[PDB]
Structures are given as structure tokens and as C-alpha cells.
Design a protein around this ligand. Structure first.
Ligand code: NA
Length: 103
């Protein structure tokens, strides 16, 4: 009927669904981020992992993309493991130079 009582409890159903949706998003990101850090501990040297942790503080979206890509590169076996801070700096300089030529 969409009388007042139905609108009230449909909108309550929406608040409950948004809360659940957002609680589930917060939980999934925390657990997946935990497992990505467990991979980064083994695939990066301590100094390289420290640099990526620092990048995540200042450029979180960039850092999340870079984590996913380093994890894929390591799984692929194409690159020697662990990735050193020197090697991570070369990857970052390559990204920087590739985006200057596309600026
Ligand atoms: Na290193």
C-alpha cells in the first residue's frame, strides 16, 4: 500500500541493509589487507616493505594498486624474491617516468 507504516519499515529495511553492506565491506578489507601484509612480509625485504607501508600512508589508493601488482609479479615467478628496496625504487621510478610521458 506504501502507507506511512510500510514506508517507515521499508526505509528501516534500507538502513539495516546499508549498515550490513558497509560492515561487511569494512570486515573484508581488514582481513584481505591482513593477508596481503602476510604476503608482503615474504615477497619484499624489510626495507622495501617499510617503503610500501610509508607510501600507503601518503597515497593509499596508489599503494593498494602497487601491493596487488607486486603480489601478482611475485606469484608469476618472473621476478626474484624477495624484492629489495633498490628494486622497489626502480619499479617506482619506471611508474613515475611512464606517467611523465603520458602527462
Ligand atoms: Na633491501
Amino acid at each position: 500500500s506504501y502507507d506511512d507504516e510500510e514506508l517507515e519499515e521499508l526505509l528501516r529495511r534500507k538502513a539495516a541493509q546499508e549498515q550490513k553492506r558497509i560492515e561487511e565491506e569494512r570486515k573484508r578489507k581488514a582481513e584481505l589487507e591482513s593477508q596481503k601484509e602476510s604476503i608482503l612480509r615474504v615477497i619484499l625485504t624489510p626495507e622495501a616493505r617499510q617503503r610500501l607501508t610509508n607510501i600507503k600512508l601518503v597515497k593509499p589508493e596508489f599503494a593498494e594498486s602497487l601491493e596487488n601488482q607486486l603480489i601478482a609479479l611475485a606469484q608469476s615467478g618472473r621476478i626474484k624474491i624477495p624484492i629489495t628496496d633498490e628494486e622497489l625504487k626502480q619499479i617506482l621510478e619506471q611508474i613515475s617516468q611512464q606517467n611523465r610521458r603520458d602527462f
